[PDB]
Amino acid sequence: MFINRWLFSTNHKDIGTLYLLFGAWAGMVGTALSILIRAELGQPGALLGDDQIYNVIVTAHAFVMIFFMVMPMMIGGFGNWLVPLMIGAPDMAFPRMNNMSFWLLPPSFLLLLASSMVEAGAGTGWTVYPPLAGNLAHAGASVDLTIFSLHLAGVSSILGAINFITTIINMKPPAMTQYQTPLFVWSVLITAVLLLLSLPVLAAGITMLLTDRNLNTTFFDPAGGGDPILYQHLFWFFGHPEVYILILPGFGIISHVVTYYSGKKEPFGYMGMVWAMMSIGFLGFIVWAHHMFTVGLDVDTRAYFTSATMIIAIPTGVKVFSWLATLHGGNIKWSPAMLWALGFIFLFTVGGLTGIVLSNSSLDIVLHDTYYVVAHFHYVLSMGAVFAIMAGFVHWFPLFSGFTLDDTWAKAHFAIMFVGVNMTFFPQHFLGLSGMPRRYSDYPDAYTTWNTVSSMGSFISLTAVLIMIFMIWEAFASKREVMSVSYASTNLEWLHGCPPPYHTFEEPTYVKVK
Amino acid sequence: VHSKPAREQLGVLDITIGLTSCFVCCLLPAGWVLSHLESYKKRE
Amino acid sequence: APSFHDKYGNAILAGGAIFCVSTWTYTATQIGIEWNMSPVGRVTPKEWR
Amino acid sequence: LLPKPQMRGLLAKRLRVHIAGAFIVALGVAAAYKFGVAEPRKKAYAEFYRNYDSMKDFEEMRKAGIFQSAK
Amino acid sequence: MAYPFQLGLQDATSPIMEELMNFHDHTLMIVFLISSLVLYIISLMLTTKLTHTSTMDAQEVETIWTILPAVILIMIALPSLRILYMMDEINNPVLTVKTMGHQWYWSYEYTDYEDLCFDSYMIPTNDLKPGELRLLEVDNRVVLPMELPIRMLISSEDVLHSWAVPSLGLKTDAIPGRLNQATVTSNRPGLFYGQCSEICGSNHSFMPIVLEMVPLKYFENWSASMI
Amino acid sequence: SEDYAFPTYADRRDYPLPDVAHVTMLSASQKALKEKEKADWSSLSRDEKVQLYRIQFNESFAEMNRGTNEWKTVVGMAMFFIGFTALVLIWEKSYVYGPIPHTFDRDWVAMQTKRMLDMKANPIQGFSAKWDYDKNEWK
Amino acid sequence: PPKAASGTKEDPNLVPSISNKRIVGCICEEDNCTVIWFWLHKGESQRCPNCGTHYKLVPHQM
Amino acid sequence: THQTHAYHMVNPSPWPLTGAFSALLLTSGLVMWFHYNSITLLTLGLLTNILTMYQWWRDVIREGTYQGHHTPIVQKGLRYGMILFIVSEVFFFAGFFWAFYHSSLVPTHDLGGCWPPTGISPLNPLEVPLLNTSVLLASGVSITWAHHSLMEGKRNHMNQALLITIMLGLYFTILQASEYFETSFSISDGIYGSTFFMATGFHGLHVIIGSTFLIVCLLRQLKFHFTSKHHFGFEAAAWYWHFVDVVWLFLYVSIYWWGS
Amino acid sequence: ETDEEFDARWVTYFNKPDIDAWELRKGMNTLVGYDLVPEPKIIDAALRACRRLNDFASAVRILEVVKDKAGPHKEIYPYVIQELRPTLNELGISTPEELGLDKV
Amino acid sequence: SHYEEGPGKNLPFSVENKWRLLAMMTVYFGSGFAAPFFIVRHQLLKK
Ligand code: HEA
Ligand code: HEA
Ligand code: CUA
Ligand SMILES: [Cu+2]
Ligand SMILES: [Mg+2]
Ligand code: NA
Ligand SMILES: [Zn+2]
């Protein structure tokens, strides 16, 4: 029974719950990895001896948070929990390959942990840039195990993306148009299109250096005509698309929570919503080399790419301005999710403006691979994606379980998260402006100050994680059921009761004839 | 989102026990490890 | 009066305030850690070789 | 007896006057940043480059003899 | 080469770094402009108490909402285009130097005449002579004359690095089989510091860079007297 | 079991008039109140006004807009837990952190400060701009 | 998609079901971005909460 | 009859989990053989994933063409998913093509500045690669004839169309193996040799996948599985085989017509 | 859209003879959906509907939600008193100020 | 239908005994937190 329903799953609700379980697992694995990183960065000198293991733990940090944490919550878990219950679908189109992607992801987790177990270790960062990960500097099974873990994550993500696109363009009742679905539907559609057209690029690159390692070829060895510039192009033509996969369900989640708790019956400018989302989904590919400005590109293509990033800044600015406009003019219930959303608005704004500051080309000549970039992606991930998924979790938890959290505990959690991330990563702004390069274990006297301050903020975030799992236990122990849910007339996921039953949408909905 | 009274209501005691429970339990790993890092360092 | 936030809110305000200022002053000053606060105005450098 | 007060577009007039306030405070803090740091850098570099002599400056850094090229 | 409680950037050594921080100050003016805008509008709409939950009309603001970002993004971008287009003037390369990034250290060669190469390493903390700098001091500094454009040919031999001198204000990726050009100019004699800025192994933190600016006269004095 | 399908009660500024009343079960005195409601209007007094208001609507705007104390409650417990994190810092400095590097004491920072003013590191605004080289003192 | 677009009082929109409860989604404006979701039960004809078109249930057992 | 929607109902299955575990065993065998020269785990990986993919598709054929849950909307979604997989493989191959184009448009300094690098003798594209194009294009036009004979309803002609397209595909595979035995150098020999050997062998992996799909669709058609219009198995076969036709054409024109 | 037939159609909609609790709830919720303080004749038609449909509590709710829609400024309300005073004592309906529902 | 559904019981972990459930969360998330601790101690032994 347990093996047939859970281990042999075929329903999106249970698959999303097990997504949430594995995502919490990988999330605090990453938290502990970041704490080893930051406690090593808390004291001047080397806490962990050699910095090879420091490179291993920053590699594991990047991998398990980017590929193993927020994609499994937002894309997998929240997508599978919401999307059928949001378009009216009973199930999704291809649930067995959905479940196969699910059951293949923890094998990639196991390969990453085994790569950590290997004597050599994955001392390369998020990037697997050759010839650091080549046959001379990383002769071992750790980097190869990371490459196959990326293979498994990529395969699971491609087949999941096929699942999302088929379950959107298929499972909808026929008379509703595409341009009137909820915003999270558009977010999962555009992200999954970006997945489908981006992950083959990563798979090609990692197979490319896989054949460089084990098949004794020379695709990245310039003594035999190789080119590491080719790997950087392939990897980051994956990377910035994968960035926009990594971020757009946050757009969808906060848009839904804002139009829920702000008293609105609709988001402002839903045509503007969908137009901006497909604009960034379309031209998210042709901006791929803004991470690239100091490898030796031509000046003309540098100007082209920085202009393209200024262009992609334009409709995201339209998105944030219209977020302000859709939270305009309504009663604001002071839910904790609104606290998360407002923190997301501020911190996404400042992170995006910092990203533009990076996007200017000569300042990127000076400030490449520096903690200013760290402050970029922590202001837009460590509180952008993190506050987005906290808002999603504390908003849809009665649908996920049947019980509610404690509002005071959740607001205290928001306060702890907020103060920890700001007085962590504003000293990282100062560190990047002062200019120490990344992936360093020890730092001089000028950097010691902000290193200590931001390390203390990292331990504040540890306290935040502990309070989060405490209130999860508190909710599951108090088990307060929900008598009524507001805005169920406009929210489809909330009208099947908390929680929705096993077999939802047996009869498909009666769409208006028009 | 309105909710009915708690099916089971934790007592100051229960809340205390639990909050501390994880706090300590979740951090204890760090405790044993971070505590003897230098020993661990010993190749011995 | 019947809610928890009437008197216990001010109580936890005072208790948390005292607790945080005491612990954070102790951490900032009473350990012996080095903030590496800026040497401008406060140090007297001496000639080296 | 009281005359007719505003019935329509209260939030509307409030929002236009306060978005105008948003522009004026945004330009105000931009001018604050300028008057604080921006032209001090230009004027400091400028006075440094008139009152600067590289030969003399090297001379007092090399009386200390703290150079690999100076002995 | 940084000072404690640093909130801004390094002071310039190069004129390009000078107008680059002028442009950077312009971008900072922009970021607090937008941040104060969004903060005050958020504060306004959290301090309000009026409700308007009707059907909002849409096709009235998108033209301003797309032309104000259009103008602000292009007037940020045209200084960026100008600075990027003047990174690469016709050079007057009075001096040439090649840097060859080795596994866990650097190599510097002057190869215009009387072929000279040397290897630069990390001074250990116990071997640090008193008064010097941890994680920045190098037993063999690299000398360059002031007030001249000198060409920098950067490459690496086994692992990619990044020769980074934020005091001079540049950072060039050292790639195996590929050398890039960086034109260095300085205004002040003296020491200037940098580091690697790519991941390169189990001593990645321990390849720093030191450039001391001397005249051409003391440059040729060192070149003659080192033999 | 079916209240998610049935119309339900709510109290917010967004929804002034709920579709259903707060109290559905109706006692005999409340049927008397309803037939008095269907009776004449001007003969209906203050107290039956207030219980009819309370049995048809749960709470009013005066008891829905009140500025409650959870903001100070949550900020108090939050910065209490920040103090707990400070104690975590106390323990973590006490146990895993060993000695600082010897390039950090007062002696070494004295020599290195003298050296970095000697080489005049970033003397425009960074460090050496706040130093007088004629009087040998801070600005 | 269904037929008989007629949401008057004398005739409502007929909806077939095999159960006692049934969902409807009103696109009650032309080219409307909003969709209005609500449940109905067997009995009196259900109505739309922002436009007022009427929906009725009929059981069909297939 | 409880299911009122015309979509698909799935009885929970172990086979996604076992396929996932078989992929994990496959990659563990790959690292075990690439580092510790052991073949047992790799053979286990091949046996596991091939068997598991066999009964997974055996289950979907059972539940589709005998039970009958494959609604016209369901194969509408199936053709969506097949198109999605096809275009994902387009961009996979196109990443490989653009890697080749980056390698070849700018020849690096160690190659003599000329494409191909000097001292190697790549095979002439004049005769046997034209044979490859001829045999693959003939197979593609034969399977278009097979689709139109599905439309017409002529069973023996469908039989000969399938027999000739499998005969052509297997002839393709065995001959490209023969000039793998008849090529001047190996995949470990240079940037140019490495890229076209990897690309052509990777296309060879896709064409043996396509040929096996043609084998299985033939054995379905012998068992009277496909019908007049619900013939999505052969639609997927036709789309994949036209895909490998056009991908072969692209790598042909690039590798052979470009720099030889 | 304009004011004259706007509040005219509001008055007629609230003063229809086939009035019901459903559409009074509809009209008042869509009224507070707008960024509008409803005018005395709209409130007059609303209390006409509440009079003919017998809901003292709904009338008190209309008064309380215009208490809410008065905004930060408290001169709107008393103006509502001075132009609706004949209707209140005409019907016997009274205000939350007199009946004590302004306090917590 | 044939599978029991409701609040809490649609989770992979049993809910009814909250002390034992707390034990499950402590061991689960504690092992998750202590995993990279076990990696780093494993190379510090191994190096
Ligand atoms: C959520 C993830 C996320 C998001 C959204 C972004 C968004 C952006 N990123 Fe970045 N980025 C990363 C994650 C992300 N990034 C990561 C993880 C790395 C490095 C990885 C590694 O180093 O290994 C990285 C690296 C990175 C670099 C490399 C720097 C270097 O290392 O040398 C650059 C430079 O161009 C860059 C730019 C941008 C830009 C220009 C945007 C924009 O999309 C931001 C747009 C958002 C806005 C909100 C626009 C602001 C507009 C307004 C506020 C409206 C009003 C203002 C005006 C009208 C002016 N990113
Ligand atoms: C998703 C991406 C992500 C996230 C959240 C974080 C979060 C954090 N990061 Fe991370 N970081 C990266 C991605 C991320 N980082 C990348 C890509 C690099 C560069 C690697 C490279 O150089 O190649 C990097 C580098 C990096 C460094 C540089 C190390 C070095 O190069 O020397 C440092 C050090 O301060 C750091 C610190 C932190 C801290 C203190 C947090 C904190 O915010 C941690 C707290 C956040 C959480 C705890 C998440 C919340 C989730 C849960 C609590 C569980 C979820 C469960 C449910 C929702 C049910 N990061
Ligand atoms: Cu060289 Cu890091
Ligand atoms: Cu990017
Ligand atoms: Mg790099
Ligand atoms: Na350190
Ligand atoms: Zn309608």
Side-chain angles (χ1 to χ4, degrees), chain A residues 114-146:
Chain A
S115 169
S116 306
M117 294 297 102
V118 169
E119 296 85 4
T124 187
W126 184 16
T127 62
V128 189
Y129 281 169
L132 175 64
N135 297 299
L136 291 174
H138 277 80
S142 61
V143 298
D144 296 329
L145 271 181
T146 57

Side-chain angles (χ1 to χ4, degrees), chain D:
Chain D
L1 195 43
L2 286 85
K4 182 180 183 294
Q6 317 93 338
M7 295 298 103
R8 254 171 300 290
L10 272 296
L11 166 62
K13 49 152 183 63
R14 179 67 180 271
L15 66 86
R16 38 182 278 269
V17 65
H18 275 56
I19 296 169
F23 292 104
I24 69 178
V25 298
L27 277 296
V29 298
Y33 184 78
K34 293 187 286 185
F35 299 150
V37 301
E39 55 271 21
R41 312 195 180 258
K42 296 183 289 294
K43 79 177 194 283
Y45 272 79
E47 62 86 20
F48 184 82
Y49 290 144
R50 279 83 66 192
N51 208 5
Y52 184 70
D53 186 42
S54 70
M55 301 335 307
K56 264 161 50 58
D57 213 318
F58 194 26
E59 196 69 33
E60 84 256 29
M61 281 151 308
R62 82 160 294 117
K63 293 289 107 176
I66 302 299
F67 282 99
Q68 274 211 325
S69 175
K71 279 303 174 58

Side-chain angles (χ1 to χ4, degrees), chain A residues 6 21 50 116-117 502, chain J residues 5 10 28 31 43 46-47:
Chain A
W6 304 97
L21 267 293
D50 62 329
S116 306
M117 294 297 102
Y502 190 31
Chain J
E5 65 187 3
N10 46 53
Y28 182 76
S31 63
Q43 293 84 18
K46 198 147 56 160
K47 182 175 73 175

Side-chain angles (χ1 to χ4, degrees), chain A residues 66 126-127 236 240 243-244 246-247 251 290-294 309 312-314 316-318 320-321 348-353 355-356 358-360 364 367-370 373 376-377 380-381 385 438-439, chain E residues 30 34 68-69 72-73 76:
Chain A
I66 278 177
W126 184 16
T127 62
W236 270 90
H240 191 98
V243 174
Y244 284 108
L246 183 63
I247 193 66
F251 293 67
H290 62 264
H291 321 273
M292 182 66 78
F293 291 165
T294 175
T309 50
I312 195 171
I314 286 177
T316 300
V318 179
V320 66
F321 281 163
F348 194 93
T349 300
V350 65
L353 294 174
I356 297 314
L358 277 296
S359 166
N360 304 266
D364 204 8
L367 274 77
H368 172 72
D369 190 359
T370 305
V373 192
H376 179 73
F377 61 69
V380 73
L381 293 174
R438 274 156 70 183
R439 317 215 173 86
Chain E
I30 301 299
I34 301 299
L68 66 89
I72 196 68
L73 276 295
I76 296 165

